[PDB]
Scaffold this motif. Structure first.
Motif, short mmCIF file in Angstrom:
data_model
loop_
_atom_site.label_atom_id
_atom_site.label_comp_id
_atom_site.label_asym_id
_atom_site.label_seq_id
_atom_site.Cartn_x
_atom_site.Cartn_y
_atom_site.Cartn_z
N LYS A 56 1.27 -1.12 -0.24
CA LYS A 56 0.02 -0.28 -0.46
C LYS A 56 0.76 1.48 0.64
O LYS A 56 0.37 2.66 -0.37
N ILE A 57 1.81 1.41 0.13
CA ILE A 57 2.92 2.51 0.79
C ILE A 57 3.20 2.83 -0.78
O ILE A 57 3.16 3.67 -1.21
N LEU A 58 3.81 1.27 -1.68
CA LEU A 58 3.78 1.52 -3.02
C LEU A 58 2.99 1.73 -3.87
O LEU A 58 3.26 2.79 -4.75
N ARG A 59 1.45 1.23 -3.51
CA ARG A 59 0.81 1.26 -4.18
C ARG A 59 0.27 2.60 -4.25
O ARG A 59 -0.36 4.10 -5.65
N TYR A 60 0.29 4.19 -3.39
CA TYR A 60 -0.36 4.50 -3.17
C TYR A 60 1.08 6.40 -3.07
O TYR A 60 0.25 7.43 -3.48
N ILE A 81 0.82 14.71 2.04
CA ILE A 81 0.97 13.14 2.25
C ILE A 81 0.04 12.56 1.93
O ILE A 81 -0.18 11.76 1.03
N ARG A 82 -0.98 12.47 2.43
CA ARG A 82 -2.67 13.06 2.32
C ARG A 82 -3.62 12.87 1.33
O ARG A 82 -4.22 12.36 1.22
N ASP A 83 -3.72 14.01 0.44
CA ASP A 83 -3.53 14.60 -0.66
C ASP A 83 -3.68 13.22 -1.78
O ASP A 83 -4.27 13.59 -2.62
N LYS A 84 -2.56 12.68 -1.67
CA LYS A 84 -1.86 12.03 -2.74
C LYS A 84 -3.09 10.95 -3.02
O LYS A 84 -3.04 10.20 -3.85
N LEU A 133 -0.26 8.46 11.97
CA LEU A 133 -1.82 9.13 10.61
C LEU A 133 -1.34 8.49 9.68
O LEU A 133 -2.27 8.60 9.42
N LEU A 134 -0.15 8.24 8.88
CA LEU A 134 0.02 6.87 7.97
C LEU A 134 -0.28 5.76 8.10
O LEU A 134 -1.08 5.34 7.60
N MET A 135 0.00 5.39 9.65
CA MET A 135 -0.74 4.02 9.68
C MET A 135 -1.82 3.72 9.56
O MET A 135 -2.74 2.45 9.14
N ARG A 136 -2.89 4.53 10.07
CA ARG A 136 -3.87 4.99 10.48
C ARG A 136 -4.34 5.31 8.95
O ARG A 136 -5.72 4.58 9.05
N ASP A 137 -4.16 5.92 8.30
CA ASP A 137 -4.98 6.58 6.90
C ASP A 137 -4.55 5.00 6.06
O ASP A 137 -5.17 5.79 4.61
N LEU A 138 -4.04 4.08 5.89
CA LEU A 138 -3.42 3.82 5.31
C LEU A 138 -4.14 2.28 5.11
O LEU A 138 -3.94 1.27 4.71
N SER A 139 -4.62 1.96 6.73
CA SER A 139 -5.69 0.87 6.61
C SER A 139 -7.14 1.61 6.28
O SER A 139 -8.09 0.52 6.09
N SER A 140 -7.41 2.50 5.99
CA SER A 140 -8.71 3.06 5.00
C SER A 140 -8.25 3.02 3.70
O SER A 140 -9.74 3.00 3.25
N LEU A 141 -7.55 2.50 3.33
CA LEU A 141 -7.21 2.19 1.96
C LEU A 141 -6.84 0.74 2.08
O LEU A 141 -6.65 -0.23 2.57
#
Ligand SMILES: [Mg+2]
Ligand SMILES: [Zn+2]
Length: 2015
Positions: free
Chosen positions: A1354-1358, A1467-1470, A1483-1491
């Motif tokens: 997900k880091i690499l995808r988004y 970071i978030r708007d991408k 915040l990144l580990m939280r928002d990345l489980s939303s995807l």
RNA sequence: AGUAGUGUGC
RNA sequence: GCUAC
RNA sequence: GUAGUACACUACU
């Protein structure tokens, strides 16, 4: 791994060059060479396409094959022919092969074929889509114009080298370079010039005073020749070279007499050259000591020493707590409790009382935590809220560990005493220690012994840290010994001392940033006894405090103030050390330097003691003063000049070596250098050459032997020559940058310039001379050598002016050149009073305010003749000159020609480089017009220098190493060939007899001599006669007379240039208050009347490098001719190579002769090298010039005896700090790039991993990301360890080292994806290619992935996919202010365009209507101006324009680590205020489980970073498909250029923007690859959504969206010579990847790598045909291996049974041998396997026929005593006549064309013939001729009557070559017939009744049919049932590795363990009965013969041995 | 005190 | 340098 | 003109 040729034909080309003399014959050799290159590319291309390789078939055959039904006469055809045809899906493709570098011949053949086949095609109604396939040989990429052809073959993997045609052409143009009938015929066309660069010249040049001086200096006829040569127009004359030939023939007499006189000096030389020995070094040392005593204040007191290391140390106390408050209280109670009365004792007690918090510790911690909570809550600093010191107990505490200096706790006398005398707050010859003293050396030695005593004990700590715990597995895997040495380092007190000083200095720098004028601060480290008081003060004043129990137990490197007695033991305080933050920065990074230095000096050497190495390296790595710099740089010259054969090390030690010994380590190191000079004399003869293995194709083993006989330098032990050169050359890279004060180096540089200018004014008058006068040029010799070199280089390449105009962009606009639009410094000569006095009053007003809180008008009054200057940037000065209409958007060369007249005064100022030498160098800042004019002159000289094969311009990126290797190998081959040729009769006579006659017979043999002159030139640009460049510009034929006239007028105005002294230099020299006595500055400036000095004869450094290169190579050609005439006087042979790089030279001389001794030749060659430099106004620096037998040394690159060599330690040591502190990813990427460059230069794997470990350590140290620290990302992500985190989120790099060296930090993502393919692809396609595994992502179950893998995908995808401009994520955002940004003109236009009524929106819409200049720049003036205004909105650019030290950048990135510095909005708007690092993690580990992660997400992951790059595909295929072979030592290393794995960005992005493809096919295919993706619409959906939520249409959002769109398109698109050092020579790309994986896995040995399938894929489009070609190549390797294996190792009677048993049940590389044999039998190149097809019995007429159709051999008949029959392939002659007269002659051909008739006449009349045709006949139409050639030689070929007359006329030119007619004989009747078949299928079985060999059968009488050979290392990839043959398993023989050698000795001397693998008996009774199933053919035994040379060596080569040297006999002797 | 220096500085 | 009045 | 000028390490030792 041979390239593409064999014995049979490569030897024929090498022979046919080495006998010819005629220019027509040489042109025929060249045309045959180009034709053979064409045929080679045709065969390999048809093999790649899997089509039939045809042989220039006519159109009749093409149509009758594609329509085999019609009448063969009715429908017509032209009489031309293609290369090959292809008819598929009722479309006929016509194919042509070009190997050109130009595209013009391709389109000429295109519209030559197209109209004739369109005449055909609309009669039979077939689409004839003709195809040309153009390969570029110097950069292998295909140019297929037919875009209707590419959908059948979207990728083509032709991977062949055209190098063995290049060297053949190279030696061909070497041999006939001085010919002139050769050159004008091999010319690409007529000599053409382009349009002029200007219409008019400069008539004011002819009356310029510098021209008057130049003209009056010459004699009268040379004045006439100069004037006649300037006004010469090569375009208006009938011959372009009539001027050059005229002036050459004028000066030829003096040239010939000079060369003959200097060559006659071979006999006047008695060989007493300047050797180094003990007397010369001792006398030079005595002169050195006298000079240094009379230049320095030599002290003998010991306590005059300076700190060798600015640190004292003592070990830790495990009984105390390591708590910060507890250590604060302990430091206070230890400072207060001092017993005794010393000077500063009461001050130390008062400072201990000022930090006393008593029992109130919780109040302290709470107060300081409250302050840090207030500071960390803001991105910016806390403004307008003052810090109040809080009385806690007895300390006024301002912050954490920042205490107020209380006047109630100290008294004023002690306070004044401490701050004045101890800290230096408010305080004539340079004093050094007596290095030559006895007691001073004894004291230095005692210091080194005491430091070794304390620091070599064990720590008591655990030996693990970040380096060991994160990289020790990879380090130990590469070399266990490097892991053990690193563990031994980590255990000792050396490592703890340097780690404590690193951590403590980082804390000192962190603490002294916000230190105030009345506060002192305490810095602490992990050692609870080592502290530091940072005093109030940009520099740093600190003082170390060490607590220790027992006295005298402290590390004291000359830095201690005093020890004192306190409570619970002793206390020691060092002196106050005042350092700037740059040297403190180097101290922080010093554990990386120490670990690198220790492991690099130690590496693979068991005779060195590690504590000795650590004892030296703790002082060199922690040295931050000039005292070691004065030793490391001269040590190269002293030790290498005393190691060499000839040097002037006496003159270097006497005159240049000046040690500057202020510390005791300087004294110790000075004695080390002295003893190493003496010892280096003693061990010249312990350098032994390794035995050289040849094959007549390549040199396999080479170099110096690895015997440890040399004496080590810096520490005791023995050493290898490579390790000796490492110890010589590595300590120069220990030195720091930026140690110089500007204050002193500006004065020194100005003094050097003015002293040379003053001496040239008052002493240098003669311009020309004849007696090698210094700073003079021999005029006739200069002119003649220049005319020769210009004639050679210009008649070789006729379109040189066109090449100069294209490559350097002379026809385009100035805004398109990177040199004229950079951010370097420029100069403006104007009237800048107002801005300078504004900044002067501002800095004075500022100064007064800072002194309240506790000049330029002076110079403008005190200097009347002051010119006024300012230094902007380059791009700003171009913007200013375009805005003021001085420059326009015309072609740049017309503007340069106009500026060469319009600009008449040149000003240059200078500043310091700040380099790591003793005396700093200087760079001369020029104004902009000087940059334009010198651009023109230097690009002309540069592109003329690149023509030269030995002028090192074309490959600046370390291709000079490859050139050194090529020169050394051809000199080895020359020496071997010449000594074995001259001495063949004498060695035959020696072997005849052979005792006593043999030695005196050997006494008269030809002696070989090899000499390398490693020269430096003394004052290259300073003491240079600039007037020779006038003759270079005037004699140049490619220039129009107006262009010559303007360039020479620029030259004349350039000799009147002025050196501006900088304003800070004048501020220094005006405020001196005492007159400096013999002041050269005041003399040259007339007592500071002016700041400008007219510099005349000194053209400045870095301004004319290529012009000087060209004249230096002319001097070396004169030297070469002198040496060649001198060795022809001795009747010997010579080879002279000479490499030139401006101020450096490497001349290598190889001589084989027998008349005189070698010492006289060395004496002659060195005296003549000096004279050849002096005749052209150079002078070789004989103090720094040395001469060897083995070692070459060009610009910091070595060549030992053909083996390349580099100090890779300089790239390891640069990797410790080299960063701009942008972020963690960028810093890590820069450091790893330095480690990659180390790998290219031959770094072993384990030291490369130590470097990557130190890189990760230093980068995590910068951002507090070490494990356990506050930004450690490990508990904020789902990961086991730091390897499982992406590099963008600050994890460590996990990848193979070959994968890191190929790409680097894209290796983490790539290796993660390869691990995913190895884990999750279905089990059948595990060992399949990477394209066949990425396509099966669709069958993954993403539900049950590991959560770590889901996070990483997900880091690499988004975040990595849709990124900006390897890329980062978490960059800290620095809050920098408006910088300087006021001197710029362009920023001022940005400011009054920002606050403009609606101007910025006009800029934004002008950008948006032409969007290509957001990722490029513009062609026009106007759009360059608009884009350079728009680049100010980028804050990165604004801060990059600011001057900035990197030490402050380091300190700020340290201190801003808990502050919110991460902009998480971007970071978030991408994927949908400021934030700290840890909240970015949460915040990144939280928002990345939303995807959500889908399969199609993973599809576009693999399609973005693997499938859309061929480099990533081939690297992934190397890692998947690897097979590692057998270990072997690195005996001959070699240079290999990294291949380009992809087989203008301005042009293609302007093309995609304005929809116009403007070169015609690249752009349309690339816009196909842009338009095909179609992910554009989400952008305009975001545009419409922002227009919805803001109503009005937005523009800044449209610009940001368009910039993101073009950047993510530029990453798909992306629009260097990298030489490696590999254990063998690679030729293909697969060879390079094999050698890169084999080299980088162990230190001790390298492995051979071969791959399963073809690793070169093209993409995800061509899958099936890629698998087809890979299986075809596997079939090829299988049967090459099997046929050569079986006729090399198996008994002759039983091989076809063995072959059939291999074919039935075996498999090579997982594919059955049955299937591979069916592939070979069904393909189109069955002729390549004729013995295989014959032994299995599948051979047909067609196969064999197609064999002699495509391949051939000349056949003679009839030596009866009258008719000859010379038959060839479709070529036969019949000649009828007597001895006197011939009646008629009938030729027979396949086609009747006048090319092919002469080709056939040449080939058919060069075999064994009867006679010499000795008569004539009158003649009218083809005939046979002969020319005479001296000493019984003739050439036999058919000419036309007309061509007989024409060639007789051309050889009847009035010349000196003695005329030979082609007197013609008998008539040639030219008929044409179909040639018969010469090889019947049934005509082999009788011919091979006793030929038992599966790889060679007889097809003719003396013609064989072979299969190529393949290395046996690939035999392990077979698999099958054991073939029990009596007592052996031949399957185990295939799997063997010690018994498959082809040498007889390596099997005879082999082991029983290696033979016990084979034995499988089951009941035999004798070994002789069981060994019958082996070979009886004689094998090859290597024989070595000594070469009679003074670097004596042995060559070893293969032999056929005798009849007894079979394979069975070797096995029996083994048994 | 430290740094730099056969140029007076910090 | 910068921030506030 | 006056006042302000803000922060890292904290460790197996
Ligand atoms: Mg050199
Ligand atoms: Zn047995």
């Amino acid at each position: 791994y041979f390239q593409g040729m064999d014995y049979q034909e490569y030897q024929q080309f090498l022979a046919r060059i080495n006998t010819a003399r005629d220019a027509c014959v040489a042109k025929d050799i060249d045309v045959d060479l180009l034709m053979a290159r064409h045929d080679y590319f045709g065969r390999e291309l048809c093999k790649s396409l899997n089509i039939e390789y045809r042989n220039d078939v006519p159109f009749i055959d093409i149509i009758l094959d594609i329509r085999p039904e019609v009448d063969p006469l009715t429908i017509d055809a032209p009489h031309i022919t293609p290369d090959n045809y292809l008819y598929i899906n009722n479309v006929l493709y016509i194919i042509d092969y070009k190997v050109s570098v130009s595209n013009e011949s391709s389109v000429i053949t295109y519209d030559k074929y197209y109209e004739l086949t369109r005449d055909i095609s609309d009669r039979l109604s077939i689409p004839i889509e003709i195809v040309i396939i153009r390969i570029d040989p110097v950069s292998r990429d295909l140019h297929i114009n037919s875009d209707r052809f590419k959908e059948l073959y979207p990728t083509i993997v032709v991977d062949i080298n055209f190098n063995q045609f290049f060297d053949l052409k190279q030696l061909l143009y070497e041999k006939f370079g001085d010919d002139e009938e050769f050159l004008l015929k091999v010319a690409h066309g007529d000599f053409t010039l382009t349009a002029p660069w200007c219409k008019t010249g400069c008539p004011e040049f002819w009356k310029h005073p510098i021209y008057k001086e130049f003209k009056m200096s010459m004699p009268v006829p040379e004045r006439r020749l100069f004037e006649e040569s300037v006004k010469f127009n090569a375009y208006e004359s009938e011959r372009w070279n009539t001027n050059l030939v005229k002036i050459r023939e004028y000066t030829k007499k003096d040239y010939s007499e000079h060369i003959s006189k200097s060559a006659k000096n071979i006999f006047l030389a008695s060989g007493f050259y300047k050797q180094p020995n003990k007397n010369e070094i001792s006398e030079g040392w005595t002169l050195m000591v006298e000079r240094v005593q009379d230049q320095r204040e030599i002290s003998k007191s010991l306590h005059d020493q300076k700190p060798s290391i600015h640190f004292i140390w003592g070990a830790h106390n495990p009984g105390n707590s390591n708590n910060a408050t507890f250590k604060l209280i302990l430091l206070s109670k230890s400072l207060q409790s001092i017993k005794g009365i010393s000077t500063y004792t009461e001050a130390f007690k008062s400072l201990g009382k000022m930090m006393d918090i008593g029992d109130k510790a919780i109040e302290y911690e709470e107060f300081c935590m409250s302050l840090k909570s207030k500071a960390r809550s803001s991105w910016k600093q806390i403004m307008n809220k003052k810090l109040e010191p809080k009385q806690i107990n007895n300390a006024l505490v301002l912050w954490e560990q920042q205490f107020m200096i209380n006047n109630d706790l100290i008294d004023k006398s002690e306070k004044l005493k401490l701050f004045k005398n101890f800290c230096g707050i408010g305080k004539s010859k340079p004093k050094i220690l007596d290095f030559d003293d006895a007691n001073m050396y004894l004291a230095s030695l005692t210091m080194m012994e005491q430091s070794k005593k304390i620091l070599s004990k064990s720590n008591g700590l655990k030996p693990d840290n970040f380096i060991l715990n994160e990289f020790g597995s990879r380090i130990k895997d590469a070399n266990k010994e490097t892991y053990d040495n690193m563990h031994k380092i980590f255990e000792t007190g050396y490592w703890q001392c340097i780690s404590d000083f690193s951590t403590l200095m980082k804390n000192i720098l962190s603490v002294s940033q916000y230190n105030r004028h009345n506060t002192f601060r305490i810095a602490m480290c992990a050692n609870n006894n080592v502290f530091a008081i940072v005093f109030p003060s940009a520099t740093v004043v600190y003082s170390i405090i060490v607590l220790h129990k027992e006295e005298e137990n402290i590390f004291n490197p000359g830095c201690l103030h005093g020890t004192f007695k306190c409570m619970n033991g002793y206390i020691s305080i060092s002196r106050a050390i005042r350092l700037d933050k740059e040297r403190c920065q180097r101290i922080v990074s010093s554990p990386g330097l120490f670990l690198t230095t220790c492991l690099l000096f130690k590496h693979d050497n068991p005779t060195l003691v590690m504590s000795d190495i650590m004892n030296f390296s703790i002082y060199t790595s922690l040295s931050i003063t000039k005292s070691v710099l004065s030793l490391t740089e001269p040590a190269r010259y002293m030790i290498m000049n005393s190691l060499a054969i000839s040097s002037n090390v006496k003159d270097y030690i006497a005159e240049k070596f000046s040690p500057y010994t202020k510390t005791l380590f300087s004294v110790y190191m000075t004695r080390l250098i002295k003893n190493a000079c003496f010892d280096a004399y003693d061990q010249r003869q312990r350098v032994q050459l390794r035995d050289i293995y040849l094959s007549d194709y390549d040199i396999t083993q080479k170099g110096i032997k690895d015997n440890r006989e040399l004496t080590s330098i810096w520490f005791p032990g023995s050493v290898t020559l490579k390790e000796y050169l490492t110890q010589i050359y590595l300590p120069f890279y220990f030195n720091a940058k930026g140690l110089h004060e500007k204050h002193h180096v500006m004065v020194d540089l100005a003094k050097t310039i003015l002293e040379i200018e003053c001496e040239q004014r008052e002493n240098i008058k003669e311009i020309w001379s004849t007696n090698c006068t210094k700073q003079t040029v021999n005029l006739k010799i200069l002119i003649h050598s220049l005319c020769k070199n210009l004639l050679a280089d210009t008649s070789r390449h006729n379109h040189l002016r066109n090449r100069i105009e294209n490559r350097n962009n002379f026809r385009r606009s100035i805004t398109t050149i990177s040199t004229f639009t950079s951010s370097k410094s420029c100069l403006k000569i104007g009237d800048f009073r107002k801005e300078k006095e504004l900044q002067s009053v501002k800095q004075k007003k500022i100064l007064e305010v800072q002194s309240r809180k506790m000049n330029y008008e002076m110079l403008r009054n005190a200097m009347p003749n002051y010119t006024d200057y300012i230094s902007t940037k380059v791009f700003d000065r171009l913007y200013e000159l375009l805005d003021k209409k001085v420059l326009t958007d015309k072609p740049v060369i017309e503007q340069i020609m106009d500026m060469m007249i319009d600009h008449k005064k040149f000003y240059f100022t200078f500043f310091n480089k700040g380099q790591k030498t003793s005396k700093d160098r200087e760079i001369f800042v020029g104004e902009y017009e000087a940059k334009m004019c010198m651009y023109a002159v230097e690009r002309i000289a540069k592109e003329r220098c690149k023509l030269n094969p030995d002028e090192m311009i074309s490959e600046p990126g370390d291709g000079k190493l490859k050139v050194l290797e090529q020169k050394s190998e051809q000199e080895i081959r020359f020496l071997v060939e010449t000594t074995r040729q001259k001495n063949r009769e004498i060695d035959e006579a020696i072997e005849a007899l052979a005792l006593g006659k043999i030695e005196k017979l050997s006494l008269g043999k030809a002696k070989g001599l090899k000499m390398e002159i490693n020269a430096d030139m003394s004052k290259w640009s300073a003491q240079d006669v600039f007037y020779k460049y006038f003759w270079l510009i005037a004699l140049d034929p490619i220039l129009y007379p107006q262009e010559k006239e303007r360039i020479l007028y620029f030259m004349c105005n350039y000799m009147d240039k002025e050196l501006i002294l900088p304003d800070e230099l004048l501020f220094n020299l005006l405020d001196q208050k005492v007159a400096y006595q013999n002041d050269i500055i005041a003399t040259m400036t007339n007592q500071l009347n002016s700041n400008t000095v007219l510099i005349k004869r000194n053209w400045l450094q870095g301004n004319f490098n290529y012009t000087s290169s060209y004249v230096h190579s002319c001097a070396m050609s004169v030297y070469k001719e002198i040496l060649k005439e001198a060795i022809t006087l001795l009747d010997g042979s010579i080879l002279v190579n000479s490499l030139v790089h401006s101020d450096d030279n490497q001349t290598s001389i190889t001589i084989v002769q027998d008349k005189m001794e070698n010492d006289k030749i060395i004496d002659f060659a060195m005296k003549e090298f000096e004279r050849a430099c002096l005749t052209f106004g150079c002078q070789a620096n004989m103090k720094k010039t040395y001469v060897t037998n083995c070692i070459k040394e060009f610009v910091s690159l070595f060549n030992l005896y053909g083996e390349p060599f580099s100090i890779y330690g300089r790239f390891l040591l640069t990797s410790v700090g080299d960063c701009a502190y942008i972020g963690p990813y960028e810093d890590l990427a820069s450091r790893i790039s330095s480690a990659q460059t180390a790998i290219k230069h031959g770094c072993p794997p384990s030291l490369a991993w130590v470097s990557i470990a130190i890189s990760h350590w230093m980068t995590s140290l910068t951002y507090n990301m070490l494990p356990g620290q506050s930004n450690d990302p490990i508990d904020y992500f789902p990961a086991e360890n730091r390897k499982d985190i992406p590099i963008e989120l600050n994890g460590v790099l996990d990848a193979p080292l070959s994968m890191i060296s190929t790409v680097g930090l894209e290796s983490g993502n790539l290796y993660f994806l390869i691990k995913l393919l190895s884990k999750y692809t279905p089990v059948m396609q595990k060992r399949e290619s990477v394209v066949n595994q990425i396509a099966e992502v669709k069958n993954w179950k993403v539900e049950d992935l590991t959560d770590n893998e889901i996070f990483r995908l997900k880091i690499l995808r988004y975040l990595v996919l849709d990124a900006e401009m390897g890329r980062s994520i978490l960059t800290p955002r620095k809050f920098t202010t408006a910088g300087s940004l006021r001197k710029l003109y362009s920023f001022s236009k940005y400011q009054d365009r920002l606050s403009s009524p609606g101007g910025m929106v006009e800029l934004f819409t002008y950008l948006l209507e032409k969007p290509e200049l957001l990722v490029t720049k513009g062609e026009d003036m106007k759009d360059y101006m608009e884009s350079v205004i728009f680049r100010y909105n980028s804050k990165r650019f604004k801060e990059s324009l600011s001057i900035q030290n990197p030490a402050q950048l380091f300190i700020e990135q340290i201190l801003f680590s808990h502050k919110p510095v991460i902009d998480f909005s971007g970071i978030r708007d991408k994927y949908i205020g400021k934030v700290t690092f840890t909240e970015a993690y949460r915040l990144l580990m939280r928002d990345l489980s939303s995807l959500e992660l889908t399969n199609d997400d993973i599809q576009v992951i693999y399609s973005y970073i693997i499938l859309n790059d061929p480099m990533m595909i081939t690297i992934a295929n190397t890692h998947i498909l690897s097979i590692y072979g057998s270990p072997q030592r690195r005996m001959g290393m070699s240079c290999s250029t990294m291949p380009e794995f992809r087989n203008s960005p301005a042009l293609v992005l302007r093309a995609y923007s304005k929809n116009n493809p403007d070169m015609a096919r690249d752009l349309v295919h690339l816009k196909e690859f842009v338009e095909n993706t179609n992910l554009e619409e989400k952008m305009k959906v975001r545009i419409a959504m922002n227009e919805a939520e803001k109503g009005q249409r937005d523009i800044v959002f449209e610009l940001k969206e368009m910039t993101r769109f073009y950047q993510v398109c530029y990453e798909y698109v992306k629009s260097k010579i990298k030489v490696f050092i590999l254990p063998a020579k690679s030729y293909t790309t697969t060879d390079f990847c094999s050698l890169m994986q084999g080299n980088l896995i162990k230190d001790k040995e390298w492995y051979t790598v071969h791959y399963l399938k073809q690793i070169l894929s093209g993409g995800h489009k061509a899958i099936m045909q890629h698998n087809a070609t890979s299986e075809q190549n596997i079939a090829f390797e299988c049967f090459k291996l099997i046929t050569h294996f079986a006729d090399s190792f198996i008994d002759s009677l039983s091989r076809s049974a063995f072959l059939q048993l291999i074919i039935d049940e075996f498999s090579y590389k997982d594919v059955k041998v049955s299937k591979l044999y069916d592939i070979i039998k069904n393909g189109y190149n069955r002729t390549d396997f004729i013995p295989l097809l014959f032994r299995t019995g599948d051979l047909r007429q067609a196969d064999l026929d197609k064999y002699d159709a495509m391949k051939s051999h000349e056949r003679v008949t009839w030596n009866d005593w009258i008719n000859l029959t010379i038959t060839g392939y479709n070529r036969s002659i019949t000649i009828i006549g007597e001895d006197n007269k011939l009646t008629y002659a009938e030729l027979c051909l396949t086609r009747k064309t006048p090319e092919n008739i002469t080709i056939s006449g040449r080939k058919l009349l060069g075999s064994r013939h009867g006679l010499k045709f000795e008569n004539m006949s009158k003649i009218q139409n083809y005939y046979i001729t002969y020319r005479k050639k001296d000493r019984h030689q003739f050439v036999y070929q058919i000419h036309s009557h007309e061509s007989i007359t024409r060639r007789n006329e051309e050889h009847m030119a009035i010349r000196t070559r003695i005329y030979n007619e082609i007197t013609p004989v008998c008539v040639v009747n030219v008929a044409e017939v179909d040639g018969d078949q010469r090889i019947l299928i049934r005509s082999l079985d009788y011919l091979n009744n006793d030929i038992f060999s599966l790889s060679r059968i007889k097809v003719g009488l003396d013609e064989f049919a072979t299969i190529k050979k393949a290395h046996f290392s690939k035999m392990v990839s077979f698999e099958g049932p054991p073939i029990k043959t009596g007592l052996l398993d031949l399957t185990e023989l295939m799997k063997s590795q010690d018994l498959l050698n082809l040498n007889y000795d390596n099997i005879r001397n082999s082991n029983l363990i290696s033979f016990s693998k084979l034995i499988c008996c089951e009941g035999s009774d004798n070994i002789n009965d069981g060994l019958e199933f082996l070979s009886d053919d004689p094998m090859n035994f290597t024989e070595g013969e000594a070469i009679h040379s003074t670097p004596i060596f042995n060559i070893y080569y293969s032999k056929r041995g005798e009849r007894h040297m079979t394979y069975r006999n070797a096995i029996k002797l083994l048994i």
